[PDB]
Design an enzyme around this catalytic site. Structure first.
Site, short mmCIF file in Angstrom:
data_model
loop_
_atom_site.label_atom_id
_atom_site.label_comp_id
_atom_site.label_asym_id
_atom_site.label_seq_id
_atom_site.Cartn_x
_atom_site.Cartn_y
_atom_site.Cartn_z
N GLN A 2 3.07 -0.17 -2.26
CA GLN A 2 2.18 0.35 -3.28
C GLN A 2 0.72 0.39 -2.85
OE1 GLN A 2 2.96 -1.20 -7.26
NE2 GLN A 2 5.07 -1.79 -6.68
N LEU B 56 -0.77 -2.38 -1.92
CA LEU B 56 -1.32 -3.66 -2.32
C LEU B 56 -1.63 -4.54 -1.12
CD1 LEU B 56 0.54 -4.12 -5.70
CD2 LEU B 56 -1.89 -3.57 -5.25
N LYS C 56 -2.36 -3.35 1.91
CA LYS C 56 -3.59 -2.72 2.39
C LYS C 56 -4.80 -3.19 1.59
CE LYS C 56 -5.22 2.03 3.78
NZ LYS C 56 -6.43 2.36 2.92
N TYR D 152 -1.34 -3.44 10.81
CA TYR D 152 -2.67 -3.96 11.09
C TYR D 152 -3.48 -3.04 11.98
CZ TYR D 152 -0.80 -8.36 9.26
OH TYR D 152 -0.18 -9.33 8.49
C1 ACO Z 1 1.53 -12.56 8.19
C2 ACO Z 1 1.27 -12.18 9.60
O1 ACO Z 1 0.29 -12.63 10.18
S1 ACO Z 1 2.35 -11.14 10.32
C3 ACO Z 1 2.68 -10.27 8.84
C4 ACO Z 1 3.85 -10.91 8.13
N1 ACO Z 1 4.18 -10.33 6.86
C5 ACO Z 1 5.44 -10.27 6.45
O2 ACO Z 1 6.34 -10.05 7.21
C6 ACO Z 1 5.74 -10.51 4.99
C7 ACO Z 1 6.61 -9.41 4.46
N2 ACO Z 1 5.92 -8.16 4.59
C8 ACO Z 1 4.98 -7.82 3.76
O3 ACO Z 1 4.46 -8.65 3.09
C9 ACO Z 1 4.59 -6.40 3.63
O4 ACO Z 1 5.38 -5.59 4.46
C10 ACO Z 1 3.17 -6.16 4.05
C11 ACO Z 1 2.25 -7.15 3.41
C12 ACO Z 1 3.07 -6.25 5.55
C13 ACO Z 1 2.77 -4.78 3.61
O5 ACO Z 1 2.63 -4.77 2.22
P1 ACO Z 1 2.79 -3.44 1.51
O6 ACO Z 1 2.27 -3.61 0.19
O7 ACO Z 1 4.16 -3.06 1.75
O8 ACO Z 1 1.83 -2.50 2.30
P2 ACO Z 1 0.99 -1.34 1.70
O9 ACO Z 1 1.65 -0.71 0.62
O10 ACO Z 1 -0.37 -1.69 1.51
O11 ACO Z 1 1.14 -0.35 2.84
C14 ACO Z 1 -0.01 0.23 3.36
C15 ACO Z 1 0.28 1.28 4.42
O12 ACO Z 1 0.76 0.65 5.59
C16 ACO Z 1 2.02 1.16 5.92
N3 ACO Z 1 3.00 0.14 6.27
C17 ACO Z 1 3.71 -0.61 5.44
N4 ACO Z 1 4.56 -1.42 6.08
C18 ACO Z 1 4.39 -1.14 7.35
C19 ACO Z 1 4.96 -1.63 8.58
N5 ACO Z 1 5.89 -2.58 8.57
N6 ACO Z 1 4.51 -1.11 9.71
C20 ACO Z 1 3.58 -0.16 9.73
N7 ACO Z 1 3.01 0.33 8.64
C21 ACO Z 1 3.37 -0.13 7.47
C22 ACO Z 1 2.56 1.75 4.65
O13 ACO Z 1 3.50 2.75 4.94
C23 ACO Z 1 1.33 2.28 3.99
O14 ACO Z 1 1.04 3.56 4.50
P3 ACO Z 1 -0.33 4.25 4.19
O15 ACO Z 1 -1.01 4.28 5.49
O16 ACO Z 1 0.07 5.52 3.61
O17 ACO Z 1 -0.93 3.37 3.18
#
Ligand code: ACO
Ligand code: ACO
Ligand code: F5U
Ligand code: F5U
Lengths: 146, 149
Positions: free
Chosen positions: B94, B96, B98, B128
């Site tokens: 969503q 969020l 980001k 990231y």
């Molecule tokens: C924590 C660390 O240091 S390593 C990170 C560990 N995190 C985790 O594994 C926990 C589980 N994962 C998550 O919490 C989620 O996948 C998050 C926090 C990484 C992303 O949260 P989301 O709310 O899904 O991301 P959000 O909706 O803001 O997505 C933002 C954008 O990034 C992109 N994006 C989302 N997931 C990914 C991914 N895995 N890889 C690349 N891009 C992504 C989205 O497609 C979206 O596209 P946009 O450019 O059109 O916005």
């Protein structure tokens, strides 16, 4: 906490975990290795907020080595700024300093010991047990200027 | 200047507030960790890690439900490292995550920490990269001591 590393003669190297590092001495040490001056109050702020501050002293006291780590006191530690006086490198001291750093973190039950290594130093940390990008994990910086 | 707490979004059939106040209940957090699949950790040690985190940033679903969190250690002057960026899977995709990260970076910038770092799972590296993070600049490698993963 304190500990005599070695003794020579023509001097004893002391390792400490106290953090009794005077920011003027460390500024000198940093200058020898060509690191850029930074505001002493900021240096002092960063030492005061370092979970671990480790030192090498050559009492004949002279600060000749330092490492420090930030940590969340529970899971993760990151090691910044390790440096050994140039007149003292190649003597196994960087190794010793790191080895007590890792041991002191392991004793405080921090299981996630990390650092960011420059290209020419990666092999010195691989030796001590550190492993770059394990399982593809990557260390990242927000808009670096190096 | 970005305030401590603010409202990100408004939808109905619920507003989503960000905060850097850091008051996250270790119980609620433990449940959010469960959802993303994370193994449970000792509450007193989670309590210790939040306590010793320079920045703790939350996403809550008022109608309070913890739905997002990020935290960072720092030395208060030079460096900062971001750990445990996570968002409730029902609210992922969503924007969020980001949104959460942008505020984290801004807060860390305002506190004038210029060296902002993190360690990224392979799957999340592109996420990231989108946000301005660069992997291995100038050959710098992120290293771990005898990793078990
Ligand atoms: C924590 C660390 O240091 S390593 C990170 C560990 N995190 C985790 O594994 C926990 C589980 N994962 C998550 O919490 C989620 O996948 C998050 C926090 C990484 C992303 O949260 P989301 O709310 O899904 O991301 P959000 O909706 O803001 O997505 C933002 C954008 O990034 C992109 N994006 C989302 N997931 C990914 C991914 N895995 N890889 C690349 N891009 C992504 C989205 O497609 C979206 O596209 P946009 O450019 O059109 O916005
Ligand atoms: C902190 C960071 O994030 S990057 C690291 C920052 N450090 C710096 O570069 C600042 C200046 N550097 C120094 O102070 C020193 O060069 C240090 C700390 C890197 C090493 O100090 P030294 O005393 O030279 O190392 P020491 O004498 O303990 O040598 C330890 C071992 O590593 C080896 N080694 C030393 N320097 C290097 C190197 N640059 N690359 C690979 N191996 C090395 C030594 O040969 C020795 O190996 P051995 O025990 O297998 O014989
Ligand atoms: C700001 O501190 C950091 C963090 C990571 C780093 N990598 C290389 C350097 C140059 C000094 N070896 C450095 C500095
Ligand atoms: C598997 O052990 C570790 C070590 C460090 C970690 N950080 C976040 C997590 C949750 C999974 N990414 C994690 C797990």
């Amino acid at each position: 906490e304190e500990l005599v590393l070695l003794e020579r003669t023509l001097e004893q190297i002391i390792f400490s975990s106290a953090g009794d590092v005077n920011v003027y001495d460390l500024q000198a040490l940093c200058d020898k290795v060509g690191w850029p001056r930074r505001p002493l109050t900021k240096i002092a702020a960063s030492l005061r907020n370092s979970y671990l501050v480790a030192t090498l002293h050559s009492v004949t006291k002279q600060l000749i080595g330092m490492a420090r780590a930030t940590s969340d006191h529970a899971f993760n530690a990151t090691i910044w700024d390790v440096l050994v006086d140039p007149s003292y490198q190649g003597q196994g001291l960087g190794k010793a300093l790191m080895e007590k750093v890792i041991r002191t973190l392991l004793q405080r039950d921090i299981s996630n010991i990390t650092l960011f290594a420059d290209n020419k130093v990666v092999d010195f940390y691989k030796n001590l047990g550190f492993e770059a990008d394990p399982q593809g994990i990557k260390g990242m910086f927000w808009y670096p200027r190096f």
